[PDB]
Design a protein around this nucleic acid. Sequence first.
DNA 1: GCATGATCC
DNA 2: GATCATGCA
Length: 580
Amino acid sequence: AKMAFTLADRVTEEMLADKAALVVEVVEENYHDAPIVGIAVVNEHGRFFLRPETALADPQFVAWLGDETKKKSMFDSKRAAVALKWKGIELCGVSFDLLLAAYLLDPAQGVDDVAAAAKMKQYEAVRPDEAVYGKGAKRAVPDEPVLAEHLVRKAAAIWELERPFLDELRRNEQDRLLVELEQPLSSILAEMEFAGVKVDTKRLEQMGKELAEQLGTVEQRIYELAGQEFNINSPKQLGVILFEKLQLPVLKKTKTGYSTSADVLEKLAPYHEIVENILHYRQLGKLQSTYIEGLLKVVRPDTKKVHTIFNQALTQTGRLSSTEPNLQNIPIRLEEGRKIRQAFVPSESDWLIFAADYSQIELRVLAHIAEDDNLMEAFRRDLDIHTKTAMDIFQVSEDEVTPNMRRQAKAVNFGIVYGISDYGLAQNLNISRKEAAEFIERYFESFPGVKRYMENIVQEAKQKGYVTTLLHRRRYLPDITSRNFNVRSFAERMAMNTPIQGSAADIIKKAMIDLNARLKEERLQAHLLLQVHDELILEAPKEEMERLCRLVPEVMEQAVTLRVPLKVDYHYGSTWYDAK
DNA sequence: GCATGATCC
DNA sequence: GATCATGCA
Ligand SMILES: OC[C@H]1O[C@@](CO)(O[C@H]2O[C@H](CO)[C@@H](O)[C@H](O)[C@H]2O)[C@@H](O)[C@@H]1O
Ligand SMILES: OC[C@H]1O[C@@](CO)(O[C@H]2O[C@H](CO)[C@@H](O)[C@H](O)[C@H]2O)[C@@H](O)[C@@H]1O
């Protein structure tokens, strides 16, 4: 049976109560400067549908939206907040975000619409956005009658679900997690996305020209070394040229056919000159297609800015991800690709890019959680953790540590920080599993506290059914009891690793909230632009650098108090590239 | 979809 | 182990 609601022609006072479920629908996935196709309000006085052209022009509605004392319950308030920012309208008073609440209760569910979140509580009087708007070449806004009911039902579900969701969160000791961390962070991210990052498109286009030339040269070379032309980007065709025509040895195969990953080519280079050229081609092509052309496609031509969207409710660790464009994987390791960063500049003249990043926050968090005396001492001494690790697993003095030993100790620390298997360590070190397991064993002999933690956490995960982070974020691990080795092993590593990475994510988010509050108190014009891995990236007047050099690291280092210090490195310059 | 590679090192 | 975007099929 249909749901009753007033399809209003104008805004009335009873639509402006001090508490309501609000829906400001933006159907386009990328909500930047996107259309708001409808509005739904549900409160103690009833259910209402307002046309945006009408509601957004009404002085009273706009003031209600911006009145922090008027509480709103929503789903993905950041989407609405940003869509509104593009229209010069402020959204305040969002006290409950169903998307963020669902995400915290179980990040594995992958809730991405009201219907999905409502299903968690046996509420089904609302359809999935997909069933209403369709998908792909069919994703279109339906007619007003269908549209109005869907938005009203979504608002109605939010209105009904707020209480049950808040109760479970409280039960999980996650109430402050939502209200004091995620929701306030949502507003900060909305500001960051809206501000965007200025791009020097001319510079990006020149690099593109230089890459095109290089690709052309390398391309022809490859054809001459193969004795013919073929689509180098076709791993199928390439495999035929490499493993059939040139008879190179097949050292690795993929479900589909011959493997041609750089991982394989490197080992094949000694056999034929074409390998190196193919590697160089892969590199240049990755920069041309993905970064040069990729970025240029999303830069707004009027402002020359890119406005990323931070998905705050996706990862199971709690880390934020970035899309359209993804500004968390911009080249930096190799100098050629690193140059790409010179294209990210301050949005104003005489402004500079300031970047601060946590130094080894994951291992510091592990030292704290596992209370490993050796590891804690290592950090209290601010030692080079990779050299320290090498010294221990290899039982040698600092001076006896060779570059290769540090490289491997570093690989072992990487495996600990990101939870990779002993097989993954082997693949990483180009050694055998048994050899990899051997290093792991030596590491545990040197850090018994970490060993104890690893064993205890896996046990706790099996007992409770989940693991938690410093700020109470949780991850359910149903596969921890699976009789399938590979499936169970994966769950065990996630049990060990999630409290580590998840806690680092918690800290980073709190630092962002603390930083923005300090920036405002100090009345600084500096503002956040991006959050990437374990770093915060800002831009500000050149006259604020000195104050920022002291303020940012302090705020970030004091976000939480652990058994070891938190350490933050910082740099700043004319472009993102120089913030090194 | 599958394979690849960029960032985490 | 994580993320997201690319070209090819
Ligand atoms: O608005 C971001 C927010 O929405 C979700 C669910 O609707 O993702 C949608 O928007 C993203 C940004 O364009 C897309 O990448 C994604 O495909 C689309 O479903 C949430 O996952 C996210 O937190
Ligand atoms: O031998 C105990 C030791 O083995 C691990 C392997 O990672 O776990 C195995 O043994 C446990 C019994 O104590 C099971 O609960 C677990 O499922 C099985 O894989 C370590 O966690 C543990 O320290």
